[PDB]
Amino acid sequence: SMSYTWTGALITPCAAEESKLPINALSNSLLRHHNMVYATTSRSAGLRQKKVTFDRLQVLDDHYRDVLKEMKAKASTVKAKLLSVEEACKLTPPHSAKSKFGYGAKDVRNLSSKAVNHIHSVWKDLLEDTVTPIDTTIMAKNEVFCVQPRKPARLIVFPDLGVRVCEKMALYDVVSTLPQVVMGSSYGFQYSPGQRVEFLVNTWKSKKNPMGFSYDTRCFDSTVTENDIRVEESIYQCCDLAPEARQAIKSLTERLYIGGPLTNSKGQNCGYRRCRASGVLTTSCGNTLTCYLKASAACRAAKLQDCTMLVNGDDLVVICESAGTQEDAASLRVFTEAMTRYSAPPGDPPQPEYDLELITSCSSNVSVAHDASGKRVYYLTRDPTTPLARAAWETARHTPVNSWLGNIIMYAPTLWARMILMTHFFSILLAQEQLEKALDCQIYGACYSIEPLDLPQIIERLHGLSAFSLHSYSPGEINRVASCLRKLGVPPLRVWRHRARSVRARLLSQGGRAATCGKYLFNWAVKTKLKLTPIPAASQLDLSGWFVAGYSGGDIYHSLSR
């Protein structure tokens, strides 16, 4: 069973692809070593193809079977509804890829009858045909990174817009509700960053003698077997569903999720997929359920005691009771052997850790600092390299999604997000006079439209007021940021402090919400700290739905509403 079989047709770009950062002012003021920053293109697609193509061997045992039975039992308590065409249309991003059938995302959002008529025909086709494979487009992703003495572009596989709308009608409620019921506290997308930290810290504190590790599966999507995908469907079918949803879910599973033909942007047949499609609604939910199923079973095979797991798609973290250093090492090898049997081998062998802060997952790790009172406070951070590389790229070129905005929101408590990202971007928004202009960013795969001026409220709601007063960061954290700045040619933190004092002054000068950004976001920069009290407007924010589920690759849109 090969994850992919290829014809020879090339994976082609849909337009010109920029692979390097252009020299400019605002950007150079952020990062000087612009040659370390690059964007992946279809020119490396061949390298990725070789990586993602391999044979999968699956061997299931009783541990797998027991866990699966328990999961289905919980899934049986879920009732999910079909989404109306109107509801599905409103979930479509304004810039989603247009349909090959004469209409685009705008038409969908506006409920044009041409688009709605086509969507109705696709749905009817799903109910009437549960066999014919559905076409998909395979593209090379254009993502920005920093060299680390270059990685090939990742591939994305997705169905036509019409099909995507139908996936929402049939499964949006399911993938948004089932995971948390089936996996409970182990489902990572139910947590905002602060909630994730609290769960990890308390889980770590609850063990008498804790040991923990992260497990990275080598090219997870490709390790997902056709059987794995049918198992996911069996879990979805456990829910109380309307007859039409059951038929559509079955049809989508057999015609799209389990596999299908691959077509490039030129319309040429590129090959055939028999693994997880990275660009469908069920990608995140499916990956999390499957990763959880295999890992829960592996914990049992390895006899790990008092196991607590945290799963986000293919990202896995396990905290358990230590049985001794030698014993732990041997257990992890057994855990790994089991995962391998289930068709989920490691990219890099997992390593037992005895300090929560040393565990890295979701690119992040827990770190510690102090609030105004001097009391310890845990927060989520990560290596700032990629965030800074993309920050530099976004300052230079116009981009649809602003990773810097997403990063400020997710990593607001960090030293780097506060001193660099906030300072740099608010400086630009000020000059360009675009403070009140809404921008698009992503959170757990979903696209959100947010006004930079709302950041203070958003940050207070998610991280609490302490996010504006953290100080005395850990030595390791400070040294990682400092070293990263030296590496990329980014001005040292001391320079950012001076820049921030100026940005803060200018923001205060404008009063209103802008002054609020100045007072709260940059209180760390001034010697004479202001007293920070709750922001009344914060409560008016509708953050329900922000941290409920993952939608990476799912073509989901929302946009902040007060």
Coordinates of C-alpha atoms in Angstrom, one line a residue:
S1 CA 0.0 0.0 0.0
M2 CA 1.8 3.1 -1.3
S3 CA 0.9 6.5 0.1
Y4 CA 1.3 7.8 -3.4
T5 CA 1.9 6.6 -7.0
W6 CA 3.0 9.2 -9.6
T7 CA 2.6 9.5 -13.3
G8 CA 5.6 11.8 -14.0
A9 CA 3.6 15.0 -14.5
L10 CA 5.1 17.8 -12.4
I11 CA 3.6 19.6 -9.5
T12 CA 3.1 23.0 -11.1
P13 CA 2.7 26.6 -9.6
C14 CA -0.4 28.5 -10.2
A15 CA 1.5 31.8 -10.6
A16 CA 4.9 33.3 -10.1
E17 CA 6.7 32.2 -6.9
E18 CA 9.0 34.5 -4.9
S19 CA 11.7 32.4 -3.1
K20 CA 13.7 35.2 -1.5
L21 CA 13.1 38.3 0.6
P22 CA 13.4 41.6 -1.3
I23 CA 15.7 44.4 0.1
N24 CA 13.8 47.3 1.6
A25 CA 13.7 49.8 4.5
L26 CA 11.1 48.8 7.1
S27 CA 12.1 45.1 6.7
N28 CA 15.9 45.7 7.0
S29 CA 15.2 47.6 10.2
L30 CA 13.9 44.3 11.5
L31 CA 16.3 41.7 10.1
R32 CA 19.6 42.3 8.2
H33 CA 20.7 38.8 7.1
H34 CA 18.0 38.6 4.5
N35 CA 19.7 35.7 2.7
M36 CA 18.9 33.4 5.6
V37 CA 15.2 33.9 4.8
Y38 CA 13.5 32.0 2.0
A39 CA 10.1 30.9 0.8
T40 CA 9.5 27.3 -0.5
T41 CA 8.3 26.9 -4.1
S42 CA 7.1 24.2 -6.5
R43 CA 10.8 24.0 -7.6
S44 CA 11.4 21.7 -4.7
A45 CA 8.2 19.7 -5.0
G46 CA 10.1 16.7 -6.3
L47 CA 12.1 16.4 -3.1
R48 CA 8.9 16.4 -1.0
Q49 CA 7.3 13.8 -3.3
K50 CA 10.2 11.4 -2.6
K51 CA 9.8 12.0 1.2
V52 CA 6.0 11.5 1.3
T53 CA 6.0 8.4 -0.9
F54 CA 6.5 5.1 0.9
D55 CA 4.8 1.8 1.7
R56 CA 2.7 1.5 4.9
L57 CA 2.6 -1.7 7.0
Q58 CA 0.0 -1.9 9.7
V59 CA -0.3 -4.6 12.5
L60 CA -3.1 -4.1 15.0
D61 CA -3.3 -5.7 18.4
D62 CA -5.8 -5.9 21.3
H63 CA -4.6 -2.6 22.9
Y64 CA -5.6 -0.8 19.7
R65 CA -9.0 -2.7 19.6
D66 CA -9.7 -1.8 23.3
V67 CA -9.0 1.9 22.8
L68 CA -11.1 2.0 19.6
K69 CA -14.0 0.4 21.5
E70 CA -13.8 3.0 24.2
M71 CA -13.6 5.9 21.7
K72 CA -16.7 4.7 19.8
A73 CA -18.6 4.3 23.1
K74 CA -18.0 8.0 23.8
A75 CA -18.7 9.0 20.2
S76 CA -22.1 7.4 20.6
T77 CA -23.2 10.1 23.0
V78 CA -22.7 12.8 20.4
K79 CA -25.6 14.2 18.3
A80 CA -24.5 16.3 15.3
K81 CA -26.6 18.2 12.8
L82 CA -26.4 18.9 9.1
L83 CA -25.4 22.5 8.2
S84 CA -27.7 24.4 5.8
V85 CA -26.2 25.5 2.5
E86 CA -26.4 29.1 3.9
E87 CA -24.4 28.3 7.0
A88 CA -21.7 26.4 5.1
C89 CA -21.3 29.3 2.6
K90 CA -20.7 31.8 5.4
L91 CA -17.9 29.6 6.7
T92 CA -16.0 29.9 3.4
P93 CA -13.0 32.2 3.4
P94 CA -13.4 35.3 1.1
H95 CA -10.3 34.2 -0.8
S96 CA -10.8 30.4 -0.9
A97 CA -9.8 28.9 -4.2
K98 CA -12.4 29.4 -6.9
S99 CA -14.3 26.5 -8.3
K100 CA -13.4 24.9 -11.7
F101 CA -17.1 25.3 -12.4
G102 CA -17.6 29.0 -13.0
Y103 CA -17.8 30.7 -9.6
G104 CA -15.7 31.7 -6.7
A105 CA -15.7 32.2 -2.9
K106 CA -17.3 35.6 -3.3
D107 CA -20.2 34.1 -5.2
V108 CA -20.5 31.4 -2.5
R109 CA -20.5 33.9 0.3
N110 CA -23.1 36.1 -1.5
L111 CA -25.2 32.9 -2.0
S112 CA -25.4 33.4 -5.8
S113 CA -27.8 30.9 -7.3
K114 CA -25.2 29.8 -9.8
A115 CA -23.0 28.7 -6.9
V116 CA -25.8 27.4 -4.8
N117 CA -27.2 25.4 -7.7
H118 CA -23.8 23.8 -8.3
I119 CA -23.4 23.0 -4.6
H120 CA -26.9 21.4 -4.6
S121 CA -25.9 19.2 -7.5
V122 CA -22.6 18.1 -5.8
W123 CA -24.6 17.1 -2.7
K124 CA -27.1 15.2 -4.7
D125 CA -24.3 13.4 -6.5
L126 CA -22.7 12.4 -3.2
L127 CA -26.0 10.8 -2.1
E128 CA -26.5 9.0 -5.4
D129 CA -22.9 7.9 -6.0
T130 CA -20.7 6.5 -3.3
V131 CA -18.0 5.0 -5.5
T132 CA -16.4 7.3 -8.1
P133 CA -13.2 8.9 -6.8
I134 CA -13.4 12.7 -6.5
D135 CA -10.7 14.8 -8.1
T136 CA -8.3 16.9 -6.1
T137 CA -5.7 19.5 -6.9
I138 CA -2.2 19.0 -5.5
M139 CA -0.1 22.1 -5.0
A140 CA 3.3 23.1 -3.5
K141 CA 2.9 25.4 -0.5
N142 CA 4.7 28.8 -0.4
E143 CA 5.8 29.1 3.3
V144 CA 8.7 31.2 4.7
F145 CA 11.6 29.8 6.8
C146 CA 15.1 30.5 7.9
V147 CA 18.1 28.4 6.8
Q148 CA 19.5 26.2 9.6
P149 CA 22.9 24.7 8.8
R150 CA 16.6 24.5 3.2
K151 CA 13.5 22.4 3.4
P152 CA 11.4 21.3 0.4
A153 CA 7.9 22.8 0.0
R154 CA 5.1 20.9 1.7
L155 CA 2.3 19.7 -0.5
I156 CA -1.4 20.5 -0.2
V157 CA -4.2 18.3 -1.7
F158 CA -7.7 19.6 -1.8
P159 CA -11.1 19.1 -3.6
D160 CA -13.1 21.7 -5.6
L161 CA -14.9 24.5 -3.8
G162 CA -18.2 22.9 -4.4
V163 CA -17.1 19.8 -2.6
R164 CA -15.6 21.8 0.3
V165 CA -18.9 23.5 0.9
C166 CA -20.6 20.0 1.0
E167 CA -18.0 18.8 3.5
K168 CA -19.0 21.6 5.8
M169 CA -22.7 20.8 5.5
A170 CA -22.1 17.1 6.3
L171 CA -19.2 17.3 8.8
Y172 CA -18.6 20.8 10.3
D173 CA -20.7 20.1 13.4
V174 CA -19.1 16.7 13.8
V175 CA -15.4 17.8 13.6
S176 CA -16.2 20.7 15.8
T177 CA -17.9 18.6 18.6
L178 CA -16.9 15.0 18.5
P179 CA -13.1 15.2 19.2
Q180 CA -13.5 16.9 22.6
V181 CA -16.2 14.3 23.7
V182 CA -14.1 11.3 22.6
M183 CA -10.8 12.5 23.9
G184 CA -11.8 14.8 26.8
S185 CA -8.9 16.7 28.3
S186 CA -6.5 15.2 25.8
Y187 CA -7.9 17.2 22.8
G188 CA -5.5 20.1 22.5
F189 CA -7.6 22.5 20.3
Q190 CA -10.0 23.1 23.2
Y191 CA -7.3 25.1 24.9
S192 CA -6.2 28.7 24.4
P193 CA -2.4 29.0 25.0
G194 CA -2.9 29.9 28.7
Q195 CA -5.3 27.0 29.2
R196 CA -2.8 24.6 27.5
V197 CA -0.1 25.8 29.9
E198 CA -2.3 25.3 32.9
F199 CA -3.2 21.8 31.8
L200 CA 0.4 20.8 31.2
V201 CA 1.6 22.4 34.4
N202 CA -1.1 20.8 36.6
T203 CA -0.7 17.4 34.8
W204 CA 3.0 17.6 35.6
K205 CA 2.4 18.6 39.2
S206 CA -0.1 15.8 39.7
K207 CA 2.5 13.1 39.1
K208 CA 4.5 11.8 42.1
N209 CA 7.7 11.5 39.9
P210 CA 6.9 12.9 36.4
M211 CA 8.5 12.0 33.1
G212 CA 7.3 13.3 29.8
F213 CA 8.0 13.2 26.1
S214 CA 6.9 14.5 22.8
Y215 CA 6.5 12.1 19.8
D216 CA 6.9 13.3 16.2
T217 CA 5.7 10.9 13.5
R218 CA 7.6 11.0 10.3
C219 CA 5.3 12.6 7.6
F220 CA 2.1 11.7 9.5
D221 CA -0.4 12.3 6.7
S222 CA 1.4 9.7 4.6
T223 CA 1.4 7.1 7.4
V224 CA -2.4 7.3 7.6
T225 CA -3.8 4.1 6.0
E226 CA -7.0 3.5 4.1
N227 CA -8.1 1.4 7.1
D228 CA -7.3 4.3 9.4
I229 CA -9.6 6.5 7.4
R230 CA -12.4 4.0 7.4
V231 CA -11.9 3.7 11.2
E232 CA -12.3 7.4 11.6
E233 CA -15.5 7.2 9.6
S234 CA -16.8 4.4 11.8
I235 CA -16.2 6.8 14.7
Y236 CA -18.1 9.6 13.0
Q237 CA -21.0 7.2 12.3
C238 CA -21.4 6.5 16.0
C239 CA -22.9 10.0 16.4
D240 CA -26.6 10.5 16.2
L241 CA -26.9 11.8 12.7
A242 CA -29.6 12.6 10.1
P243 CA -30.0 10.0 7.3
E244 CA -28.6 12.3 4.7
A245 CA -25.5 13.2 6.7
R246 CA -24.7 9.5 7.2
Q247 CA -24.9 8.9 3.4
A248 CA -22.9 12.0 2.6
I249 CA -20.2 11.2 5.2
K250 CA -20.0 7.6 3.8
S251 CA -19.8 9.0 0.3
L252 CA -17.1 11.5 1.1
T253 CA -15.1 8.9 2.9
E254 CA -15.1 6.4 0.0
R255 CA -14.7 9.0 -2.8
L256 CA -12.4 11.6 -1.2
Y257 CA -11.0 10.9 2.2
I258 CA -9.7 7.4 1.7
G259 CA -7.9 8.5 -1.5
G260 CA -8.3 9.6 -5.1
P261 CA -6.6 11.0 -8.3
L262 CA -4.2 14.0 -8.1
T263 CA -4.3 16.8 -10.7
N264 CA -1.8 19.7 -11.0
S265 CA -2.7 23.3 -11.7
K266 CA -2.4 22.6 -15.4
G267 CA -5.0 19.9 -15.3
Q268 CA -2.6 17.1 -15.8
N269 CA -3.0 13.8 -14.0
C270 CA -0.2 13.7 -11.4
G271 CA -0.9 10.5 -9.6
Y272 CA -3.0 8.8 -7.0
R273 CA -3.3 9.2 -3.2
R274 CA -4.1 6.5 -0.7
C275 CA -3.3 8.4 2.5
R276 CA -4.7 11.5 4.3
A277 CA -5.5 14.5 2.2
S278 CA -3.9 17.6 3.8
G279 CA -6.6 19.9 2.5
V280 CA -10.0 18.6 3.6
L281 CA -12.3 19.5 6.5
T282 CA -11.6 16.3 8.4
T283 CA -7.8 16.6 8.2
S284 CA -7.3 18.0 11.8
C285 CA -10.1 15.9 13.5
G286 CA -9.0 12.8 11.6
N287 CA -5.3 13.3 12.4
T288 CA -6.0 14.0 16.1
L289 CA -8.4 10.9 16.5
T290 CA -5.9 8.6 14.7
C291 CA -2.9 10.0 16.6
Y292 CA -4.8 9.6 19.9
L293 CA -5.9 6.1 19.1
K294 CA -2.5 4.9 18.1
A295 CA -0.7 6.6 21.0
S296 CA -3.2 5.5 23.7
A297 CA -2.7 2.0 22.5
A298 CA 1.1 2.4 22.4
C299 CA 1.0 3.7 26.0
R300 CA -0.7 0.4 27.0
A301 CA 1.8 -1.7 25.1
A302 CA 4.7 0.1 26.8
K303 CA 2.9 -0.2 30.1
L304 CA 3.4 3.5 30.9
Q305 CA 1.8 4.3 34.2
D306 CA -0.6 7.1 35.0
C307 CA -0.5 8.3 31.4
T308 CA -1.9 11.8 30.5
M309 CA -1.8 12.7 26.8
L310 CA -2.2 16.0 24.9
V311 CA -2.9 15.8 21.2
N312 CA -3.0 18.4 18.4
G313 CA -3.3 16.7 15.0
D314 CA -0.1 14.7 14.6
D315 CA 1.6 16.5 17.5
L316 CA 1.7 14.4 20.7
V317 CA 2.8 15.0 24.3
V318 CA 2.8 12.4 27.0
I319 CA 3.2 13.0 30.7
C320 CA 3.3 9.9 33.0
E321 CA 4.7 8.4 36.2
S322 CA 8.5 7.7 36.0
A323 CA 9.6 4.1 36.7
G324 CA 13.3 5.1 36.9
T325 CA 15.6 6.5 34.3
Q326 CA 16.7 3.2 32.8
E327 CA 13.2 1.9 32.9
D328 CA 11.8 5.0 31.2
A329 CA 14.3 4.8 28.4
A330 CA 13.3 1.2 27.7
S331 CA 9.6 2.0 27.9
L332 CA 9.9 4.7 25.3
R333 CA 11.5 2.3 22.9
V334 CA 8.6 -0.1 23.4
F335 CA 6.2 2.8 22.9
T336 CA 8.0 3.6 19.7
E337 CA 7.9 0.0 18.5
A338 CA 4.2 -0.1 19.0
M339 CA 3.6 3.2 17.2
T340 CA 5.7 1.8 14.4
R341 CA 3.6 -1.3 14.2
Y342 CA 0.5 0.9 13.9
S343 CA 2.1 2.7 10.9
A344 CA 3.3 5.8 12.7
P345 CA 7.1 5.6 13.0
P346 CA 9.1 8.5 14.6
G347 CA 11.0 11.1 12.7
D348 CA 13.4 11.4 15.6
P349 CA 13.4 8.9 18.5
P350 CA 11.4 10.3 21.4
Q351 CA 13.4 11.2 24.5
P352 CA 12.3 11.1 28.2
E353 CA 12.4 14.5 29.8
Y354 CA 12.2 15.3 33.5
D355 CA 11.6 19.0 33.3
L356 CA 8.3 20.2 31.7
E357 CA 10.1 23.2 30.2
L358 CA 12.3 20.9 28.1
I359 CA 9.4 19.3 26.4
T360 CA 8.7 20.8 22.9
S361 CA 5.4 20.3 21.1
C362 CA 3.4 22.4 18.7
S363 CA 6.8 24.1 18.2
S364 CA 6.2 25.4 21.7
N365 CA 7.3 24.8 25.3
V366 CA 6.3 26.0 28.7
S367 CA 8.5 28.7 30.3
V368 CA 8.3 30.8 33.5
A369 CA 8.4 34.5 34.4
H370 CA 7.1 36.8 37.1
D371 CA 4.1 39.1 37.3
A372 CA 3.9 42.6 38.9
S373 CA 3.6 40.9 42.3
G374 CA 6.7 38.8 41.8
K375 CA 4.7 35.6 41.7
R376 CA 5.8 32.9 39.3
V377 CA 3.7 32.6 36.1
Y378 CA 3.9 30.0 33.4
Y379 CA 3.3 30.9 29.8
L380 CA 3.7 29.3 26.3
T381 CA 6.7 30.3 24.2
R382 CA 8.6 28.9 21.2
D383 CA 11.8 29.5 19.2
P384 CA 11.3 32.9 17.6
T385 CA 13.3 32.2 14.4
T386 CA 10.4 31.2 12.1
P387 CA 8.1 33.9 13.5
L388 CA 10.8 36.5 12.9
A389 CA 11.6 35.3 9.4
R390 CA 7.9 35.5 8.4
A391 CA 7.6 38.8 10.2
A392 CA 10.5 40.1 7.9
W393 CA 8.8 38.7 4.8
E394 CA 5.4 40.2 5.6
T395 CA 7.0 43.6 6.2
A396 CA 8.5 43.5 2.7
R397 CA 5.8 41.8 0.6
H398 CA 2.0 42.0 0.7
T399 CA 0.6 38.8 2.1
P400 CA -3.0 37.5 2.5
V401 CA -2.4 36.0 6.0
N402 CA -0.3 37.9 8.6
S403 CA 1.5 35.4 10.8
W404 CA 2.9 38.2 12.9
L405 CA -0.7 39.1 14.1
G406 CA -1.4 35.5 14.8
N407 CA 1.8 35.2 16.8
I408 CA 1.2 38.4 18.9
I409 CA -2.2 36.9 19.9
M410 CA -0.9 33.4 20.6
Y411 CA 2.4 34.4 22.1
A412 CA 1.5 37.8 23.6
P413 CA 3.2 37.0 27.0
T414 CA 6.6 36.2 25.4
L415 CA 9.7 38.4 25.5
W416 CA 10.1 38.3 21.7
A417 CA 6.4 39.0 20.8
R418 CA 6.2 41.9 23.1
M419 CA 9.6 43.6 22.5
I420 CA 9.9 42.9 18.8
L421 CA 6.7 42.0 17.0
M422 CA 4.5 44.5 18.8
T423 CA 7.1 47.3 18.6
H424 CA 7.9 46.7 14.9
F425 CA 4.4 46.3 13.6
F426 CA 2.6 49.0 15.6
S427 CA 5.4 51.3 14.4
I428 CA 4.4 50.6 10.8
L429 CA 0.7 50.7 11.3
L430 CA 1.2 54.1 12.9
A431 CA 3.2 55.5 10.0
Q432 CA 1.0 53.9 7.4
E433 CA -2.1 55.0 9.4
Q434 CA -3.7 51.6 9.3
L435 CA -4.4 51.0 13.0
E436 CA -8.1 50.6 12.4
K437 CA -7.7 48.3 9.4
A438 CA -8.7 44.7 9.9
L439 CA -6.2 42.0 8.9
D440 CA -6.4 38.3 8.4
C441 CA -4.5 35.8 10.6
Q442 CA -5.0 32.1 11.5
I443 CA -5.7 30.4 14.8
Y444 CA -5.7 26.6 14.9
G445 CA -6.0 26.6 11.1
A446 CA -9.1 28.8 11.0
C447 CA -8.9 32.3 9.4
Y448 CA -9.8 35.3 11.5
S449 CA -10.2 39.0 10.5
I450 CA -9.0 41.2 13.4
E451 CA -8.4 44.9 14.1
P452 CA -4.9 45.5 15.6
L453 CA -6.6 48.1 17.8
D454 CA -8.4 45.3 19.6
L455 CA -5.2 43.5 20.6
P456 CA -5.2 44.8 24.2
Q457 CA -8.7 43.5 24.9
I458 CA -8.0 40.2 23.1
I459 CA -4.7 39.7 25.0
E460 CA -6.4 40.4 28.4
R461 CA -9.2 37.9 27.6
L462 CA -6.8 35.1 26.6
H463 CA -3.8 35.7 28.8
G464 CA -5.1 37.8 31.6
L465 CA -3.6 41.2 32.7
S466 CA -0.3 39.5 33.7
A467 CA 0.6 39.4 30.0
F468 CA 1.3 43.1 30.2
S469 CA 3.5 42.8 33.3
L470 CA 5.7 39.7 32.8
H471 CA 9.4 40.2 33.6
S472 CA 12.4 38.3 35.0
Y473 CA 12.1 35.8 32.1
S474 CA 14.2 32.6 32.5
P475 CA 17.9 32.6 31.5
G476 CA 17.4 30.0 28.9
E477 CA 14.5 31.9 27.3
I478 CA 16.4 35.2 27.3
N479 CA 19.5 33.4 25.8
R480 CA 17.4 31.7 23.1
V481 CA 15.9 35.0 21.9
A482 CA 19.2 36.8 22.1
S483 CA 21.0 34.1 20.2
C484 CA 18.3 34.1 17.6
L485 CA 18.5 37.8 17.1
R486 CA 22.3 37.6 16.6
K487 CA 21.8 34.7 14.1
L488 CA 19.2 36.6 11.9
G489 CA 20.8 40.0 12.2
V490 CA 18.0 41.5 14.3
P491 CA 18.8 44.5 16.5
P492 CA 19.4 43.5 20.2
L493 CA 16.6 43.8 22.7
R494 CA 18.0 47.0 24.2
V495 CA 17.4 48.7 20.8
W496 CA 13.8 47.5 20.8
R497 CA 13.2 48.9 24.2
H498 CA 14.2 52.4 22.9
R499 CA 12.1 51.9 19.8
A500 CA 9.1 50.8 21.9
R501 CA 9.3 53.9 24.1
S502 CA 8.9 56.0 21.0
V503 CA 6.1 53.9 19.5
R504 CA 4.3 54.0 22.9
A505 CA 4.6 57.8 23.1
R506 CA 3.2 58.2 19.6
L507 CA 0.3 55.9 20.4
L508 CA -0.6 57.7 23.6
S509 CA -0.6 61.0 21.6
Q510 CA -3.6 59.7 19.6
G511 CA -5.8 58.8 22.6
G512 CA -8.7 56.5 22.2
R513 CA -8.0 52.8 21.6
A514 CA -4.6 53.7 20.2
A515 CA -3.5 55.2 23.5
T516 CA -4.8 52.1 25.2
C517 CA -2.5 50.0 23.0
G518 CA 0.3 52.3 24.1
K519 CA -0.5 52.1 27.8
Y520 CA -1.0 48.3 28.0
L521 CA 1.2 46.7 25.2
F522 CA 4.2 48.8 26.0
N523 CA 4.2 49.3 29.8
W524 CA 7.2 47.0 29.8
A525 CA 9.2 49.6 27.9
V526 CA 8.8 52.5 30.3
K527 CA 10.8 53.0 33.5
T528 CA 7.8 54.4 35.3
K529 CA 5.1 51.8 35.1
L530 CA 1.4 52.8 34.8
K531 CA -1.2 51.0 36.8
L532 CA -3.0 48.5 34.6
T533 CA -6.7 47.8 35.3
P534 CA -9.1 45.6 33.4
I535 CA -10.4 46.9 30.1
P536 CA -14.3 47.0 30.2
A537 CA -14.5 46.5 26.4
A538 CA -12.7 43.2 26.7
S539 CA -15.9 41.4 27.9
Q540 CA -17.9 42.5 24.9
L541 CA -15.7 40.4 22.7
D542 CA -17.2 37.2 21.3
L543 CA -14.3 34.7 21.6
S544 CA -16.5 31.7 21.7
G545 CA -15.4 29.4 18.9
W546 CA -11.8 30.6 19.0
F547 CA -10.4 27.6 20.9
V548 CA -12.9 24.8 20.3
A549 CA -11.3 22.8 17.5
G550 CA -8.6 22.6 14.9
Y551 CA -9.3 23.3 11.2
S552 CA -5.9 23.3 9.6
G553 CA -6.4 22.7 5.9
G554 CA -10.2 22.8 6.4
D555 CA -11.0 26.1 4.6
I556 CA -12.7 27.7 7.6
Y557 CA -13.3 31.4 8.1
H558 CA -14.9 33.5 10.8
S559 CA -13.6 37.0 11.6
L560 CA -13.8 38.6 15.1
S561 CA -17.2 40.0 16.1
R562 CA -17.9 42.2 19.1

